[PDB]
Amino acid sequence: XXFXXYX
Numbered sequence: 001x002x003f004x005x006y007x
């Protein structure tokens with residue numbers, strides 16, 4: 001990953 005969220 002490396003980004004975040006939450007979707």
Ligand SMILES: *[C@@H]1O[C@H](CO)[C@@H](O)[C@H](O)[C@H]1O[C@@H]1O[C@@H](C)[C@H](O)[C@@H](O)[C@H]1O
Pocket residue numbers: none
């Ligand atoms: C997500 O990132 C925030 C900001 O740094 C941090 O406070 C949370 O603990 C962190 O969540 C962790 O990492 C994610 C990728 C997992 O889905 C979540 O369950 C928790 O382990």
Ligand SMILES: *[C@H]1O[C@H](CO)[C@@H](O)[C@H](O)[C@@H]1O
Pocket residue numbers: 003007
């Ligand atoms: C979850 O999915 C969305 C839609 O593709 C992305 O924008 C996001 O960075 C993550 O991959």
Ligand SMILES: *[C@H]1C[C@H](N)[C@@H](OC)[C@H](C)O1
Pocket residue numbers: 005006007
């Ligand atoms: C992260 C927080 C967000 N409110 C949620 O959407 C329902 C997602 C599943 O997790």
Ligand SMILES: [Cl-]
Pocket residue numbers: 004005006007
């Ligand atoms: Cl998510």
